[PDB]
Structures are given as C-alpha cells and as structure tokens.
C-alpha cells in the first residue's frame, strides 16, 4: 500500500493517472516457473492498439500481504481494448512479461476496498484496490501475427538456401552421428517437424528478437544468441540463451542460432546445419526497438 503514495509523491507527479492493481500468486504462476521471488524490479508499461504505439516504463514495488481482512486476498501486492505489460526479473535467470487489460479495470474500479476481475490473456482472477483519493478482436492479436510473419519469412529463406545447394544437406558442426543406421535416411521426418514447430512457436522473447537489439558492433558480432525448443512438444522451450556444440550432439533438439546481423542457423540432431536469412523492414525495427529497448 505504501507504494501508491510513494509513486504519488515521486512518479505520480511525473505521470498523470494511476490504477493501483494487486496480483495473486496464482496469477504469478503463469509467468514464473518453479519460483516465488519478490517482485521489486517489475516494470509496468502501456501498449495501445490500432491508433499509435508507445510504452512508459515504471516500477511499482510488490510485497506479499496479510493486510486483507478477507482470507481470499492473501498474497502479493503491486479507448479501453489495450494492453499493459509487466516485465519481471531478479538477480538470477528469470524474465517474465505479464499482460493486464482494460475493461477489467474500469468496471473493477466500482464501489479494504477490493474487487475481483478476470484476465483475458492468461485467465485467472485478480483483485483491484480503489483508494479514497481516487474494434475488439484485432487488438490482442498483433504481437502474435507480426512475429509469426517473421517466422514464415525465415522459414521461406531456409528453403531458398536449400534451393542454393541442390536440396540435400551439409554438416557444419563436428558431431558424430549416433550410429550408422540404415533406417536413418528417413530424416525427412525430422525437417518437416522443424516447419511444424517454428511456425507454431511465437513469443515476444525469441532469439532473433534479441539478435535485432544490439548494444555494440563488436561483441554481438563475436556472440551468438540461441534457442532450442524440443521436437514435437514434450516440454518447456528455452529462449534467449547466450553463447559467450553440445546441442547438436544430444537428440530432441532442433537448435536455432541467430547472429546479430540477422543470420540464422537451423541445426538438426546429427549436426546438419542450414543457414537462413532475415528480412526486417524499418517498421519492424521500430516495433522491436520500441518494446525490447
């Protein structure tokens, strides 16, 4: 609760209006895997569709709370149709982006003053506090479709490079094949699944997105940004791994590696490597520069 008056004496005198929102830990279970760390650095930003695009980045400190007299609210405290996003980190390796929406808030702000609301993006119940001082369908979809268009172009670019090389293969990474099977040259089974998952994988924190955003010329030219999502959907996919290889050695890994210059590499089990090319218009650079940086 102290965070509200802290903002109103320091940031509320820099930003006009504020809506004070409390998030249960069950809603936190969406973003963070297997961790309950305190949410100080959490950055809330706004993002509004179909007119113009802008974000304003601010920390509201979160602490776990016993202060509701109602038992049910035991937990953490921190043009309608648009988005807010909370970017959550700690000292360790954990980054999450949560999306709060409107028309849960303007209806929710209706009278411990508290009311329950629903999430649209990641459906759970949240609770809104009101302090005594106080075109639908295209709007969420864009961050999906934009990124998925990139995937299609990247996938098509792979095909063009295979069209360069008489449509077979070449091995760029020294990985010994697991055995010299006779029943291995049906590896057409593998490459199809690449175009299965690469098109069905879309998230804001893809590897090539971080490859687009480069602080330096030299160190990103020397550095590789990789992600491996497993085959066929068993488990949780990892994005944004840094290489300051073993991925080709172990199975269940369609490795994908992007340089900062937009050059991509699809690596199959067995060390087969296909180079891919990226195409980004300055609109796309403007969008990724806006959100990511």
């Amino acid at each position: 609760m102290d965070v509200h008056i802290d903002n109103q004496v320091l940031s509320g005198l820099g930003t006009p209006l504020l809506v004070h929102l409390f998030v249960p830990d069950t809603v936190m279970a969406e973003l963070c895997p297997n961790r309950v760390p305190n949410c100080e650095g959490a950055w809330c930003q706004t993002l509004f569709s179909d007119r113009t695009g802008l974000t304003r980045v601010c920390r509201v400190f979160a602490a776990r709370g016993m202060l509701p007299g109602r038992p049910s609210h035991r937990g953490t405290f921190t043009n309608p149709f648009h988005v807010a996003a909370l970017r959550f980190y700690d000292e360790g390796g954990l980054v999450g982006e949560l999306q709060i929406y409107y028309l849960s808030l303007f209806e929710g702000a209706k009278r411990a003053l508290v009311r329950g609301i629903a999430h649209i993006f990641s459906p759970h119940a949240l609770y809104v506090v009101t302090y005594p001082e106080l075109s639908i369908l295209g709007a969420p979809e864009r961050e999906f479709r934009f990124l998925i268009s990139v995937a299609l172009r990247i996938s098509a670019s792979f095909r063009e490079k295979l069209a360069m090389q008489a449509w077979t293969a070449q091995q760029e990474i020294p990985v010994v094949i697991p055995t010299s099977y006779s029943r291995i040259y049906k590896n057409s089974d593998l490459i199809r699944e690449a175009f299965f998952t690469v098109q069905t994988r879309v998230s804001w924190e893809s590897c090539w997105v971080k490859a687009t955003i480069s602080n330096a010329p030299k160190t990103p030219d020397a550095c590789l940004w990789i992600d491996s999502h497993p085959l066929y959907e068993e488990g949780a996919s990892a994005w944004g791994k840094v290489i300051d290889v073993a991925l080709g050695t172990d199975g269940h890994c369609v490795h994908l590696a992007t340089t900062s210059d937009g050059q991509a590499f699809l690596v199959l089990p067995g060390g087969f490597v296909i180079k891919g090319q990226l195409a980004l218009t300055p609109e796309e650079r403007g969008y990724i520069l806006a959100r990511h940086g």
Binding site: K110, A118, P140, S188, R192, F195, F196, Q199, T200
Partner: protein
C-alpha cells in the same frame, strides 16, 4: 526432399488456425460473461435511482399536508 516441405506448411497452417479458433471462442465466452455481469449491475444501478426517487415522492408527500 522438397515435396514434404509443403506438407509441413499445410499441417502448420491447420494448427495455427485452430489456435485462433480456440482462443477466440474462449475470450468471447469469458468477456460475454463479464458483460452479463455488467448489464446486471447496470439495471440494478438505475433501479437504485428508481427506488430513491420513489422514496422521495413518498417522503415529500408526507409533507404535503404540512405544505397545504
């Protein structure tokens, strides 16, 4: 093999379209539930005005014989 590429795109198009069908129906269901709650509160919120003004009519009509 170049022929299997198309097959990979066809299955991927099917899955990507099904994701939107499922997401769109779920969000329509949840938001329509929210607006049924909203119209419930709306009709109650002016039924309050109705009953406040009815009580105003009776409370001032009790003062009619004190205003004649």
């Amino acid at each position: 093999s170049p022929e299997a590429l198309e097959l990979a795109e066809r299955e991927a198009e099917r899955a990507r379209s099904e994701r939107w069908d499922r997401c769109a129906q779920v969000l329509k269901n949840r938001l329509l539930r929210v607006e049924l709650d909203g119209i419930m509160r709306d009709h109650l919120a002016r039924a309050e005005e109705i009953r406040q003004d009815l009580d105003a009519v009776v409370a001032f009509s009790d003062g009619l014989e004190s205003m004649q």
